[PDB]
Write an enzyme that holds these catalytic residues in place. Sequence first.
Site, mmCIF file in Angstrom:
data_model
loop_
_atom_site.group_PDB
_atom_site.id
_atom_site.type_symbol
_atom_site.label_atom_id
_atom_site.label_comp_id
_atom_site.label_asym_id
_atom_site.label_seq_id
_atom_site.Cartn_x
_atom_site.Cartn_y
_atom_site.Cartn_z
ATOM 1 N N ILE A 41 17.638 9.184 23.609
ATOM 2 C CA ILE A 41 16.904 10.416 23.887
ATOM 3 C C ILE A 41 15.492 10.066 24.341
ATOM 4 O O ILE A 41 14.856 10.820 25.080
ATOM 5 C CB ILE A 41 16.792 11.329 22.638
ATOM 6 C CG1 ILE A 41 18.144 11.949 22.301
ATOM 7 C CG2 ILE A 41 15.780 12.441 22.894
ATOM 8 C CD1 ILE A 41 18.088 12.898 21.117
ATOM 9 N N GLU A 100 11.660 7.543 23.406
ATOM 10 C CA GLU A 100 10.818 6.651 22.621
ATOM 11 C C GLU A 100 9.960 7.472 21.659
ATOM 12 O O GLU A 100 9.037 8.166 22.088
ATOM 13 C CB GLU A 100 9.900 5.863 23.558
ATOM 14 C CG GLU A 100 10.609 5.244 24.757
ATOM 15 C CD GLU A 100 9.715 5.180 25.985
ATOM 16 O OE1 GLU A 100 9.305 6.256 26.474
ATOM 17 O OE2 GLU A 100 9.419 4.060 26.458
ATOM 18 N N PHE A 152 20.405 18.072 16.388
ATOM 19 C CA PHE A 152 20.074 17.773 17.778
ATOM 20 C C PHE A 152 19.825 19.025 18.617
ATOM 21 O O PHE A 152 20.573 19.994 18.525
ATOM 22 C CB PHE A 152 21.216 16.916 18.372
ATOM 23 C CG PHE A 152 21.123 16.685 19.869
ATOM 24 C CD1 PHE A 152 21.758 17.552 20.761
ATOM 25 C CD2 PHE A 152 20.379 15.622 20.380
ATOM 26 C CE1 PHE A 152 21.649 17.371 22.140
ATOM 27 C CE2 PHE A 152 20.257 15.423 21.753
ATOM 28 C CZ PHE A 152 20.900 16.308 22.647
ATOM 29 N N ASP A 166 0.692 15.749 15.195
ATOM 30 C CA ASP A 166 0.832 15.177 16.528
ATOM 31 C C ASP A 166 1.614 16.092 17.437
ATOM 32 O O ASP A 166 2.515 15.653 18.147
ATOM 33 C CB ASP A 166 1.491 13.784 16.472
ATOM 34 C CG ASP A 166 1.506 13.091 17.832
ATOM 35 O OD1 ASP A 166 0.443 13.059 18.498
ATOM 36 O OD2 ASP A 166 2.583 12.589 18.245
HETATM 37 N N1 LIG Z 1 16.476 16.482 16.839
HETATM 38 C C1 LIG Z 1 16.082 16.105 18.121
HETATM 39 N N2 LIG Z 1 16.779 16.543 19.242
HETATM 40 C C2 LIG Z 1 16.250 16.108 20.373
HETATM 41 N N3 LIG Z 1 16.738 16.471 21.597
HETATM 42 C C3 LIG Z 1 16.371 16.273 22.862
HETATM 43 C C4 LIG Z 1 15.005 15.914 23.180
HETATM 44 C C5 LIG Z 1 14.593 15.787 24.521
HETATM 45 C C6 LIG Z 1 15.542 16.022 25.549
HETATM 46 S S1 LIG Z 1 15.027 15.950 27.221
HETATM 47 N N4 LIG Z 1 13.759 14.796 27.318
HETATM 48 O O1 LIG Z 1 14.466 17.280 27.470
HETATM 49 O O2 LIG Z 1 16.164 15.478 28.035
HETATM 50 C C7 LIG Z 1 16.907 16.367 25.259
HETATM 51 C C8 LIG Z 1 17.317 16.492 23.914
HETATM 52 S S2 LIG Z 1 14.854 15.088 20.156
HETATM 53 C C9 LIG Z 1 15.013 15.316 18.421
HETATM 54 C C10 LIG Z 1 14.013 14.687 17.541
HETATM 55 O O3 LIG Z 1 13.975 15.003 16.349
HETATM 56 N N5 LIG Z 1 13.159 13.837 18.130
HETATM 57 C C11 LIG Z 1 12.057 13.129 17.573
HETATM 58 C C12 LIG Z 1 12.216 12.232 16.439
HETATM 59 F F1 LIG Z 1 13.430 12.027 15.861
HETATM 60 C C13 LIG Z 1 11.071 11.543 15.912
HETATM 61 C C14 LIG Z 1 9.781 11.739 16.503
HETATM 62 C C15 LIG Z 1 9.625 12.622 17.623
HETATM 63 C C16 LIG Z 1 10.758 13.315 18.152
HETATM 64 F F2 LIG Z 1 10.602 14.159 19.213
#
Ligand SMILES: Nc1nc(Nc2ccc(S(N)(=O)=O)cc2)sc1C(=O)Nc1c(F)cccc1F
Length: 294
Positions: A10, A12, A78, A123
């Site tokens: 997904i 970094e 997710f 953040d």
């Molecule tokens: N639970 C969860 N789901 C995500 N989905 C998701 C995010 C971006 C795209 S995109 N770039 O639009 O294609 C698609 C799906 S990131 C995330 C999280 O918790 N993430 C997460 C983490 F674990 C720790 C620190 C920061 C975070 F954002």
Amino acid sequence: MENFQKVEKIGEGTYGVVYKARNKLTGEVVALKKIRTEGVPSTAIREISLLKELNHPNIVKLLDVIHTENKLYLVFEFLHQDLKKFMDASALTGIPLPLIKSYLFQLLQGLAFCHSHRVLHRDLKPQNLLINTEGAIKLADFGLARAFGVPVRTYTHEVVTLWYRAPEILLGCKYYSTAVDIWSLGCIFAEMVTRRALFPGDSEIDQLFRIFRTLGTPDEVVWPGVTSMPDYKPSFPKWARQDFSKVVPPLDEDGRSLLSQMLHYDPNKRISAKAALAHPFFQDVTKPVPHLRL
Ligand SMILES: Nc1nc(Nc2ccc(S(N)(=O)=O)cc2)sc1C(=O)Nc1c(F)cccc1F
């Protein structure tokens, strides 16, 4: 690890790598976060373990906190898209105000909840805000700076964004206040409205000076105690505050007023998430559904 078949990276995270994964034993799709080493504080992490109990519709559900191999695994429900990708997708026409209003209102509810439970995000940024096809938006990540902090990058040499960082943090304040999240959300709010980062600094001082040039260099009048801050220098240039109407057009006066309150220099004067929820900007708030391309 093994009970998880990684689907795609997904991205970094600022602590490690976040993967879209499937629980090979439950079949549910989750966001798996692997943390960056030589043991890590087991007492500090307990905070995280407490975050599992923070349940709210505007906060990403933390399903699990695992410790194994000096690797800390966090399993989150997710979501399909982050706010940065969505804004970029809408850059040509902009996100419609009603939707901007709904997301802002929901993020404030989320913050109001976290702050009432003494949890600070610290953040907030477009990339840490997740949205679904239902029109909801949720707070993801959460700093966890008291149980971890901020590295010399993230986890593997990567440019940390300072755009949404509150001035008291930039001035070296050690104790974070929930007001820092409000500042960040304020910056994000202006960004959705204008489709331009409000304060795009590429260094702490550049970030600070961009804020000053726009809101005016702060002084004891507008921010009692500011000249006492760790990194405050009497040598800072003295910029006059810019007319606020030039900052976020064509946001209406209700929106500008709320934004000015979210961007108050003095943390004690900055509006809380709870009071912002009662601001007249939200009198006609609704919950539109966004046009999402997955
Ligand atoms: N639970 C969860 N789901 C995500 N989905 C998701 C995010 C971006 C795209 S995109 N770039 O639009 O294609 C698609 C799906 S990131 C995330 C999280 O918790 N993430 C997460 C983490 F674990 C720790 C620190 C920061 C975070 F954002």
